[PDB]
């Protein structure tokens, strides 16, 4: 049997039946005037009242444009008040936006509008250069919401639409309206299909209930520097946000002077970081020159934060409940939650990262024997519940492959639960690599090695590193007569690929360390290192 952990809070109504926009906005006439978007950039404020009447203005413009139910879009944007307003008026449409990086390579960025059959890009003028050729061959609309070059239409042309003319529809529960990109347990990134069921059972896991597991309310002023292309900021922060009412203060990008002037400036409560966002908060000379005392709660996620770092973030927020929370894109995303930010909060260990969210189950497989553990052994992470993805788009197998016909995802991180119900992450099973946070698929990288005419095998694996936590590197087998060089190789994927997919290190080899089978022992390399 089965040994299943749950959270040491009670299950709670969930109103999964609703819209993500009717669920996000069911309060809004409580906080209809307060702030909604400030943007860090220009300092433009948005109310909850804008937010939703510009949501809704740019559904009746997307229709126009021909976004019908179950269309997509994609986003190529920064973090902005345009990518809420495209997200949300595509949710109302019963419509689905996938969202992307927009520092991604022309050739990435097109991978993924192909897959997932994006009728309209949403971007800035500077970027129309990547999609431009394949937009025009393919009747695929560009929006800029800066200057639209040739061939484009301004942002705009979706805010003049009337609100009134959004058309009649029916969205179920399990329509998608999110498609975010990962590569899940194995191989190449995959559309995630996250559902109105799906985002609203996670938002309410989050911030729902009478002692809500992240306590968050309408008088906070929550940071949003993680990027909202990513499924940790547009869920947890901007969604939650939504629900509860809080001012969610927008960054284009990190800088640590920008970073520091917001959150003394605007009087910042909620910090939802990453590790190295921690790691420059602990660094940097000009910290200790700024007041943070009005953080409340500080977040880390993404990747693992380590008891050195937990201990610095204490001294330079002393007012912050700190703690962690664990996602994942498939999961819907979040897995387990930090019990320090509850409205009644629990007591905490460093180096936990939660414990599992309400209203689901998890269990700790070990993956020898298939054998579900008790408390304090350590095993595959595996969760069930409404907040899990419909599956992969256009991909059966592997949707096969990553949820089970009881409905349990296997996530592929090693971890125990202890007699607190504190979840540790200790390994990871999957060859997935995190660069500050963000994913990257040995895979995808591996494939661009194979290709390369004096590279024989290839193998990328991450390496452990301060600035970053992990870095890829890539074992390589070179071809006969090859002489191909470290830097050479680097140069070849650099051209290729996003900045923090880079290869940082090259290890030519006689041979990848292989299982009998021929699987890459990837534990093995790892050791090495
Ligand atoms: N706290 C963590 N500690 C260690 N590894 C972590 C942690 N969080 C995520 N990971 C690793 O990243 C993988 C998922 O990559 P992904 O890029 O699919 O997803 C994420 O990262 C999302 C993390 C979130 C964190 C929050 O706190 C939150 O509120 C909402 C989301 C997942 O399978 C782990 O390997
Ligand atoms: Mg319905």
């Not at 800035?124 to 061939?151: L, R």
């Not at 299909?193 to 597991?213: I, R, W």
């Not at 977040?299 to 962690?324: H, I, W, Y």
């Not at 070179?478 to 191909?484: P, Q, W």
């Amino acid at each position: 049997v089965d040994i299943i952990f749950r959270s040491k809070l009670p299950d709670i109504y969930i109103p999964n039946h609703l819209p993500l926009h009717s669920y996000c906005f069911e309060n809004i006439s409580e906080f209809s005037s307060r702030p909604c978007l400030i943007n860090g950039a220009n300092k433009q404020i948005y109310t909850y009242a804008d937010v939703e009447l510009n949501s809704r203005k740019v559904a009746a413009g997307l229709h126009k444009q021909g976004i019908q139910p179950k269309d997509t879009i994609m986003i190529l944007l920064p973090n902005s008040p345009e990518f809420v307003f495209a997200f949300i008026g595509a949710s109302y449409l019963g419509a689905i936006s996938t969202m992307a990086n927009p520092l991604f390579t022309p050739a990435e960025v097109v991978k993924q509008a192909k897959a997932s059959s994006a009728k309209i890009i949403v971007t800035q003028a500077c970027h129309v250069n990547k999609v431009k050729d394949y937009a025009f061959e393919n009747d695929v609309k560009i929006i800029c919401i800066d200057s639209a070059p040739e061939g484009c239409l301004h942002f705009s042309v979706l805010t003049q639409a009337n609100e009134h003319d959004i058309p009649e529809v029916e969205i179920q529960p399990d329509d998608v309206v999110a498609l975010p990109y990962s590569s899940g347990t194995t191989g190449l990134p995959k559309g995630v299909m996250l559902t109105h069921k799906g985002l609203v059972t996670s938002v309410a896991q989050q911030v729902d209930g009478e002692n809500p597991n992240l306590y968050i309310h309408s008088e906070d002023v929550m940071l949003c520097v993680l990027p909202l292309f990513h499924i940790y900021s547009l869920n947890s922060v901007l969604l939650c946000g939504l629900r509860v009412g809080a001012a969610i203060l927008i960054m284009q990008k990190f800088d640590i002077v920008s970073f520091l002037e917001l959150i003394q400036r605007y009087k910042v409560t909620i910090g939802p970081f990453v590790p190295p966002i921690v790691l420059a908060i602990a660094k940097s000379p000009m910290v200790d020159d700024y007041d943070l005392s009005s953080v409340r709660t500080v977040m880390s996620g993404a990747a693992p934060l380590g008891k050195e770092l937990e201990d610095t973030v204490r001294a330079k927020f002393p007012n912050a409940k700190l703690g962690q929370g664990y996602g994942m894109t498939e999961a819907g995303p979040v897995l387990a939650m930090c019990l320090a930010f509850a409205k009644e909060p629990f007591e905490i260990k460093s180096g936990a990262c939660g414990t599992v969210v309400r209203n689901a189950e998890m269990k700790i497989v070990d993956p020898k024997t298939g054998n579900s553990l008790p408390r304090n052994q350590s095993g595959e992470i595996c969760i069930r519940g409404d907040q899990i993805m419909k599956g992969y788009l256009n991909d059966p197998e592997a949707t096969a492959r990553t949820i089970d016909k009881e409905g349990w995802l296997y996530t592929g991180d090693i971890g125990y639960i202890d007699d607190d119900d504190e979840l540790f992450i200790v390994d990871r099973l999957k060859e997935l690599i995190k660069y500050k946070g963000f994913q990257v698929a040995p895979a995808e990288l591996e494939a661009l090695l194979l290709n390369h005419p004096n590279i024989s095998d290839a193998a990328v694996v991450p390496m452990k590193d301060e600035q970053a936590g992990e870095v890829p590197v890539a074992f390589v087998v070179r071809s006969n007569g090859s002489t191909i060089t470290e830097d050479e190789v680097k140069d070849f994927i650099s051209k290729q690929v996003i900045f923090y997919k880079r290869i940082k290190r090259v290890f030519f080899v006689d041979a990848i360390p292989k299982s009998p089978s021929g699987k890459i022992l990837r534990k093995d390399l790892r050791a090495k290192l």
